[PDB]
From Swiss-Prot:
SUBUNIT field: Interacts with AMS1, ATG8 and ATG11.
Function: Cargo-receptor protein involved in the cytoplasm to vacuole transport (Cvt) and in autophagy. Recognizes cargo proteins, such as AMS1 and delivers them to the pre-autophagosomal structure for eventual engulfment by the autophagosome and targeting to the vacuole.
Designated name of the protein: Autophagy-related protein 34
Compartment(s) of residence: Preautophagosomal structure membrane
Chain segments carrying region AMS1-binding: 1-103
Length: 103
């Protein structure tokens, strides 16, 4: 139901704290990897857990040190276990993000 990918930007605790929830129809395959851009820092991919998430299940992407928010106009995409961009966050003018789709 919609590829939209609910997300939440914390940006606190002296660090970052992302929370994504697979709302899409299909269920994450697992072993995915994130990748967000920025200005102060560069782009970086975080190794996600191998275990899936779930239509409801969530996911965390703790990063250090941290980045400025919100992340509007950013990339913050999502790849698969093959490091292939599976989805892409619109990264709107809000801590909220809902992956749309590449192709």
């Amino acid at each position: 139901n919609d590829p939209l990918l609910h997300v939440e930007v914390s940006n606190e605790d002296n660090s970052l704290h992302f929370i994504l929830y697979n709302k899409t129809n299909i269920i994450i395959p697992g072993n995915c990897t994130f990748e967000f851009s920025s200005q102060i820092s560069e782009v970086f991919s975080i190794k996600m857990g191998p275990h899936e998430i779930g239509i409801k299940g969530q996911k965390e992407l703790w990063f250090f040190p941290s980045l400025p928010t919100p992340l509007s106009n950013y990339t913050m995409k999502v790849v698969n276990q093959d490091g292939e961009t599976i989805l892409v966050g619109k990264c709107a003018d809000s801590n909220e993000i809902t992956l749309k789709s590449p192709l």
